[PDB]
Design a protein around this ligand. Structure first.
Ligand SMILES: [Zn+2]
Ligand SMILES: [Zn+2]
Lengths: 48, 214, 102, 48, 511, 49
RNA sequence: GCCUGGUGUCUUGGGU
DNA sequence: GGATTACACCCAAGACACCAGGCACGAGA
DNA sequence: TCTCGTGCCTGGTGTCTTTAATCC
């Protein structure tokens, strides 16, 4: 249970849009802004 | 000898069960109530014991002979995850589940509470009963400067200066020992009692600043 | 709640004052004590809560050496040790104290 | 009003894909029309 | 009164002494809005002070609670929170006063109210458009699907008016593809589609001849009868009630291993409740659900036989507007359960001490007060921790740029379909909008055609009890459902009251 | 200066103008790279040279 | 006696 | 039976962690 | 003067069950 949780945190640190499992959440309730989400979409590093 | 009490294949099985974090003690309690309430009836709860280890968050362990008894023990318990998540423990793993586990005068500890939270302190002595320890601490004082404290609005650390106290705001008790605002300072250090549970004795890392001082 | 240092049982502290320890009070006499005595033989600090339902057939109970005691809540680890004067008095009674603090 | 408001985004997407498909295509000094890989798209621009 | 009592129990063996702890919620009382200073002093709050000092214009709500203590060897006015008051309503301190004294309270007589004040900011609730409950709608399905026609209904109770469940009946089989063209249904909390005949048998009507007598009311219609042919044969081997009910329970999202002796009794709950709960939920009334089920299948086949067009989703008679009243009740319902569980979780610790709880220490008014304030201030319709998936924009800052804009803003309606999904059907001005929503007033841009505005003479139904209507229908000749046979009644008219088939009458013209 | 304005300057063939807009007139930055491994791992003290 | 830092993430309403 | 796609720019107003445990201070006996 | 209760501040840690088309 503890090793899988280290795998989990390292995964959602890089990509928090993994299909088929719940997103990592901030205490405010909104999803964590992972590095992958920083680069994609209209406002990310590349298009924005 | 403890070695004669090791478990064997003749002993009941132990299952682990996942429960809501922080609710492990409650589940152990609830299991005991159910067991005692059903003793001697036509439908006894066929578990022997249940327990929860702090080191093992989110789990309760339950001793029985049949898996069905585990389901029976937990039925209706609002603190237990409904998924059929129980797991079997090996006989060779049993005793480690029940392993029960410092502090010496002259050694260093880190304080865990109050304005001295995080500060390094020397253990001077412990109470006869065995609960609180007298600590030697670099004080964080103001000499009553703005009187008519918290850890976020405290003072810098500096050895007690009795002549500064004499000038600005004090009871002499012995050679180098003063009581100032109802605390004791000997040769510049505060000597104050803390609960042993309020100090950290393990894995202390002295800081740069502490290496410079001590 | 406090835990008896001798037998490890967990009870509300006032119980130790009202009725004594249900396992130990024949030798510990907490029922007829003051609060200072109760607090020297029972601890507010303990870890590993154990429901023992069947003392005499539980392996868990045998390991914790509570197999001859009454069904109830027990602690795996009880912090503190009996005062040396009480240990000495128990030994006068043929009772051997095995500390439960680890 | 609905049509103008809806189909403006349809054609806006069309223009974006067209530009990215064609942005690197340049006339070179030998008259050929090539992309950034030097692939020949036309041997002579516009055939004239 | 939706969940009127809390109940605990312990079988005292510690001389068994069952001690049920019970708490009953009674009458509600309301007080006028009151400002309580840090001092402790109180006074009547009027809106002008509330705007200036960024306060919330709200009324304290008190609830009677009653304790009772069953013991078997074998309170008063507790404060539950503050509810924001709509200005100029019956519970606002401005409703009285009279024109002379309005000027002294700095209130303008042209201000018609209809809005709330939350932290000094004026918030108006926007009417939310939704589909009607308790009505059957038939739609056609796209080509790459084995289904060609679907009947759908979302069932919602009359009391409260709240959603419960949703149910579908799908007709499989494409055009000359799909072989056996049978019909299966979808039931709440069951993982797989179940053929129609099986659920008919599972309700207590098992021989074929009675089943077809409940659906088709025209023995000559061989086209319709031919389409029900494969449904009989694919559910032939299930020949009695018991094996039918068990076939259901073996799919309904439960645990593994509840045996036939009980897996029936779990499925009987999924049939009695959750399946069409708007008709009835008391026992021994399964004749109404069986008759209604036959009606659905009949409607399904009429569309598949091209004798009736598929329903028009934009027909305004199939639509409802949720205004301030219904919207607050749904939110208040969610929050009152949250307050309830915090009371229940608190009793299990405070009774292990065996100390009489002072009640006022077991009602935290922050649950309702912060809940209503947060949702009205942000528009996030739900619990704060679940801000996504919840609907946004229900509350908006009242536009005060000009007087005309205030009138329009208080009469606005919203359809919550999105910006995802292009097409045109929810955006078009449909013919049935005539006289009910404005044909001209609509925003430019992304909301165009989805946000609408009520025509000048429109009104919204407040709601009325259906019970007096039933009494009027039976007094003037309506005949019960147990007396009805398609051979005898081959021509009478069916009567619906709020979507439940309640009777039949042979001479509708006089009625 | 969005994506569509970028394309217009390409069509004009004003390559020099486009470079300046997106660098000198904005967020131009100087980095050091290692000629061997190509990474921006250089530690550069400019007063000690 | 030169240097001189004031937020973010959303949502909603608008403009062409 | 799975995601990815869904014009551009701009303006402005309107918002923000919860629960439990421990320690300290004040009041009452 | 001592003990108990209440309030405030700081630190640690989640969970009752409840929009639509296309292509690969
Ligand atoms: Zn004992
Ligand atoms: Zn290098």
């Amino acid at each position: 249970e503890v090793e899988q949780l280290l795998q989990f945190h390292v995964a959602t640190y890089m990509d928090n849009d993994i299909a088929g499992q719940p997103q990592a959440l901030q205490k405010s309730g909104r999803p964590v802004k992972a590095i992958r989400a920083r680069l994609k979409g209209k406002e990310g590093r590349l298009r924005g | 000898p403890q070695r004669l009490l090791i478990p064997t294949v003749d002993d009941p099985g132990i299952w682990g069960v996942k429960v809501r974090l922080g609710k492990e003690k409650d589940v152990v309690r609830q299991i005991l109530k159910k067991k005692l309430a059903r003793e001697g009836t036509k439908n006894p709860l066929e578990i022997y014991s249940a327990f929860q280890r702090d080191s093992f968050k989110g789990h309760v362990y339950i001793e029985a002979r049949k898996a069905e008894a585990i389901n029976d023990a937990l039925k209706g318990n609002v603190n237990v995850f409904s998924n059929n998540s129980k797991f079997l423990v090996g006989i060779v793993e049993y005793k480690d589940l029940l392993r029960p586990v410092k502090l010496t005068r002259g050694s260093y500890v880190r304080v865990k509470n109050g304005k001295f939270k995080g500060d390094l302190a020397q253990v001077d002595e412990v109470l006869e009963n065995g609960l609180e320890a007298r600590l030697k601490l670099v004080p964080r004082l103001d000499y009553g400067k703005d009187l008519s404290y918290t850890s976020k609005f405290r003072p810098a650390q500096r050895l007690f200066s009795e002549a500064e106290a004499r000038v600005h705001e004090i009871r002499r008790d012995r050679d180098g020992f003063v009581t100032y605002g109802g605390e004791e300072y000997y040769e510049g250090f505060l000597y104050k009692t803390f609960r042993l549970q309020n100090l950290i004795v393990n894995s202390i890392n002295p800081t740069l600043n502490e290496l410079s001082l001590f | 709640e406090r835990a008896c240092m001798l037998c490890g049982i967990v009870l509300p502290g006032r119980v130790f004052m009202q009725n004594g320890c249900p396992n130990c009070d024949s030798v510990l006499n907490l029922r007829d004590s003051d609060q200072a005595t109760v607090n020297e033989c029972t601890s507010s600090s303990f870890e590993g809560l154990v429901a023992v339902g069947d003392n005499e057939h539980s392996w868990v109970a045998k390991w914790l050496r509570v197999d001859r005691f009454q069904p109830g809540l027990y602690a795996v680890r009880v912090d503190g040790r009996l005062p040396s004067d009480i240990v000495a008095a128990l030994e006068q009674y043929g009772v051997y104290y095995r500390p439960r603090d680890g | 009003l609905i049509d103008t408001a809806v189909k403006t985004a349809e054609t806006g997407y069309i223009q974006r894909r067209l530009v990215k498909a064609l942005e690197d295509i340049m006339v070179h000094y030998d008259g050929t029309t090539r992309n950034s890989l030097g692939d020949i798209i036309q041997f002579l621009y516009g055939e004239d | 009164w939706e969940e009127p009592r809390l109940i605990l129990d312990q079988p005292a063996q510690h001389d068994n002494i069952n001690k049920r702890y019970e708490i009953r919620f009674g009458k509600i009382y309301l007080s006028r809005p009151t400002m309580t200073e840090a001092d402790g002093t109180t006074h009547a709050m009027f809106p002008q002070e509330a705007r200036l000092r960024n306060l919330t214009y709200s009324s304290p709500v008190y609830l009677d609670m009653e304790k009772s203590m069953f013991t078997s060897i074998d309170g008063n006015k507790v404060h539950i929170g503050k509810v924001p008051i709509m200005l100029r309503s019956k519970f606002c301190s401005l409703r009285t006063l009279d024109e002379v004294d309005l000027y002294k309270m700095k209130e303008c007589p042209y201000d018609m109210g209809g809005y709330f004040v939350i932290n000094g900011s004026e918030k108006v609730l926007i009417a939310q458009e939704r589909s009607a409950a308790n009505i059957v709608q038939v739609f056609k399905k796209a080509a790459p699907s084995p289904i060609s026609h679907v009947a759908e209904i979302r069932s919602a109770l009359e009391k409260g008016s709240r959603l419960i469940s949703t149910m579908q009946i799908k007709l499989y089989g494409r055009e000359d593809k799909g072989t056996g063209r049978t019909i299966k249904a979808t039931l709440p909390y069951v993982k797989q589609d179940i053929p129609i005949v099986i659920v008919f048998r599972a309700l207590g009507v098992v021989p074929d001849g009675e089943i077809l007598q409940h659906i088709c009311y025209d023995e000559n219609d061989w086209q319709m009868l031919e389409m029900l042919k494969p449904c009989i044969e694919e559910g032939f081997v299930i020949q009695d009630k018991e094996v039918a009910l068990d076939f259901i329970g073996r799919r309904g999202s439960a645990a593994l291993g509840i045996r036939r002796e009980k897996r029936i009794q779990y499925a009987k709950d999924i049939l009695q409740k959750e399946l069409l709960p708007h008709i009835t939920q008391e026992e021994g009334f399964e004749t109404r659900k069986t008759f209604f089920l036959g009606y659905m299948v009949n409607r399904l086949l009429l569309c598949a036989l091209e004798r009736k067009d598929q329903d028009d989703r934009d027909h305004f008679g199939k639509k409802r507007l949720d205004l301030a009243g219904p919207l607050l009740a749904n939110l208040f319902r969610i929050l009152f359960r949250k307050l309830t569980r915090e009371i229940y979780r608190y009793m299990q610790r405070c009774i292990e001490t065996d100390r009489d709880f002072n009640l006022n220490l077991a009602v935290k008014s922050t649950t309702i007060t912060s809940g209503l304030k947060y949702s009205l201030a942000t528009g996030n319709w739900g619990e704060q921790k679940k801000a996504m998936s919840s609907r946004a924009g229900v509350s908006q800052v009242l536009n005060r740029y000009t007087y005309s804009s205030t009138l329009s803003h208080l009469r606005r309606t919203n359809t919550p379909i999105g910006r995802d999904g292009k097409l045109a059907k929810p955006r078009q001005l449909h013919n049935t909008h005539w006289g009910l929503v404005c044909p001209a007033e609509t925003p430019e841009g992304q909301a165009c055609g989805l946000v609408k505005n009520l025509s000048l003479l429109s009104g919204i139904s407040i709601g009325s009890p259906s019970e007096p209507i039933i009494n009027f229908l039976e007094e003037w000749g309506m005949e019960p459902l147990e007396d009805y046979d398609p051979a005898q009644h081959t021509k009478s008219t069916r009567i619906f009251v709020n979507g439940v088939w309640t009777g039949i009458h042979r001479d509708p013209s006089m009625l | 200066f969005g994506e569509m304005e970028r394309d217009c300057m390409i069509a004009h063939g004003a390559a020099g103008f486009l470079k300046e807009r997106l660098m000198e007139a904005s967020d131009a930055f100087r980095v050091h790279v290692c000629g061997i491994c190509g990474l921006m791992s250089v530690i550069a003290n400019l007063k000690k040279n």
